[PDB]
Amino acid sequence: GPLGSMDQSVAIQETLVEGEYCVIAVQGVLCKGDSRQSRLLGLVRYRLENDAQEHALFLYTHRRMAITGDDVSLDQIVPLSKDFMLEEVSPDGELYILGSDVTVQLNTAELKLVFQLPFGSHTRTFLQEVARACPGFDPETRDPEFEWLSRHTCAEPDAES
């Protein structure tokens, strides 16, 4: 009974693979038309025996309640790059878009979706990890890295969903 956090992080760790290192992984939502969908987020930090490390934003699919980690594995890949940027949705709420929820819109070079994560709690940890994941709030940030992702082959795309 860890209390304060579910097992998202663990779920990925099991699905991930040895030698690697899981840092954080929450659970967001994706709303389209009138069909609600559930997506499992994950962040993995990979280091080299020579120091030189790299980060990438892993995407894990999952059923409605397949969060457990039992039936969820790599579904896509999103490597942090300069073209990466997060945009808040027009508040027009009262003073805050979050509070009781988290409204964030990822505007990458091509990736453009809407994720609704739960207010802080386990979501806050994710935000901070992303910042250090490479951006390290630098005014001259511009050095994408993904040459090591090729290592990953992701689950078999035989889903035919």
Curated annotation (Swiss-Prot):
<protein>
    <recommendedName>
        <fullName>Type II inositol 1,4,5-trisphosphate 5-phosphatase</fullName>
    </recommendedName>
</protein>
<comment type="subunit">
    <text>Interacts with APPL1, PHETA1 and PHETA2. Interacts with several Rab GTPases, at least RAB1A, RAB2A, RAB5A, RAB6A, RAB8A, RAB9A and RAB33B; these interactions may play a dual role in targeting INPP5B to the specific membranes and stimulating its phosphatase activity. Interacts preferentially with non-phosphorylated RAB8A; phosphorylation of RAB8A on 'Thr-72' disrupts this interaction. Interacts with INPP5F.</text>
</comment>
<comment type="function">
    <text>Hydrolyzes phosphatidylinositol 4,5-bisphosphate (PtIns(4,5)P2) and the signaling molecule phosphatidylinositol 1,4,5-trisphosphate (PtIns(1,4,5)P3), and thereby modulates cellular signaling events.</text>
</comment>
<feature type="domain" description="PH">
    <location>
        <begin position="27"/>
        <end position="153"/>
    </location>
</feature>
<comment type="similarity">
    <text>Belongs to the inositol 1,4,5-trisphosphate 5-phosphatase type II family.</text>
</comment>
